[PDB]
Amino acid sequence: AMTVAYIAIGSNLASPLEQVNAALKALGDIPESHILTVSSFYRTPPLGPQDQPDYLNAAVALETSLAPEELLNHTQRIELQQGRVRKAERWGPRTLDLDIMLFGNEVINTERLTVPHYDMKNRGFMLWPLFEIAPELVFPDGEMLRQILHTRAFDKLNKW
Numbered sequence: 001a002m003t004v005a006y007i008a009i010g011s012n013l014a015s016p017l018e019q020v021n022a023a024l025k026a027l028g029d030i031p032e033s034h035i036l037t038v039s040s041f042y043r044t045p046p047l048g049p050q051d052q053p054d055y056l057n058a059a060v061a062l063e064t065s066l067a068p069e070e071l072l073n074h075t076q077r078i079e080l081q082q083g084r085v086r087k088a089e090r091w092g093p094r095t096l097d098l099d100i101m102l103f104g105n106e107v108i109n110t111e112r113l114t115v116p117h118y119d120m121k122n123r124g125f126m127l128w129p130l131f132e133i134a135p136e137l138v139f140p141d142g143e144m145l146r147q148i149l150h151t152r153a154f155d156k157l158n159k160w
């Protein structure tokens with residue numbers, strides 16, 4: 001059985017365009033998986049701490065037969081192989097961030113994975129690229145992406 005995973009991409013260090021292109025190549029090389037769709041790249045102001053560069057944000061649809069945690073292993077590996085370093089400050093800048101937003105209709109609460117991503121419904125930098133690639137999306141709780149984006153106040157997201 002194949003499931004579409006929706007993965008958010010963020011980068012604000014060490015040439016984000018290069019980082020995101022390298023990540024797309026690496027995502028392609030994940031086994032049991034195929035990239036179905038790539039969003040536009042967006043240049044977004046930082047949420048959380050603001051004393052950092054703007055982000056390049058994007059979303060990808062990845063159809064896979066991997067187990068969710070097995071997909072997470074690959075995304076974490078790719079981040080680490082692209083130089084991601086853990087420092088003290090909460091929500092610091094990073095070379096690459098790969099968040100599993102959704103894994104089909106699944107609701108996952110394990111030590112390493114919480115899906116849907118806990119805060120995606122409150123982040124334009126996640127929802128707008130997701131709507132670009134999956135305008136018909138429905139969340140596990142039945143909420144429609146189109147309805148969220150019609151109703152909630154979010155700034156326009158600007159393309160890179």
Ligand SMILES: Nc1ncnc2c1ncn2[C@@H]1O[C@H](COP(=O)(O)CP(=O)(O)OP(=O)(O)O)[C@@H](O)[C@H]1O
Nearest residue numbers: 091097098099100101111112113114115116117119
């Ligand atoms: N849906 C998900 N996608 C990716 N990692 C997830 C996840 N659910 C839980 N995690 C866990 O998240 C842990 C911490 O990841 P971090 O990348 O440091 C959070 P962040 O992306 O900087 O901020 P955010 O979670 O507010 O977006 C990972 O080690 C991983 O086990």
Ligand SMILES: Nc1nc2[nH]c(SCC(=O)c3ccc(Br)cc3)nc2c(=O)[nH]1
Nearest residue numbers: 010011044045046047048055057091125
């Ligand atoms: N634009 C942009 N800003 C970012 N800030 C972070 S840190 C976690 C985070 O999303 C965050 C979001 C909302 C609140 Br409230 C606090 C933290 N990552 C990104 C990113 O990918 N893009």
Ligand SMILES: [Ca+2]
Nearest residue numbers: 028029030033
């Ligand atoms: Ca593949």
Ligand SMILES: [Ca+2]
Nearest residue numbers: 049050051089
């Ligand atoms: Ca700071």
Ligand SMILES: [Ca+2]
Nearest residue numbers: 010097098099
């Ligand atoms: Ca994140």
Ligand SMILES: [Ca+2]
Nearest residue numbers: 097098099100
């Ligand atoms: Ca993350």
Ligand SMILES: [Cl-]
Nearest residue numbers: 084085094095
């Ligand atoms: Cl980093």
Ligand code: NA
Nearest residue numbers: 001002003004
């Ligand atoms: Na399926």
Ligand code: NA
Nearest residue numbers: 032065066067
């Ligand atoms: Na499998």
Ligand code: NA
Nearest residue numbers: 139141142143
């Ligand atoms: Na809900």
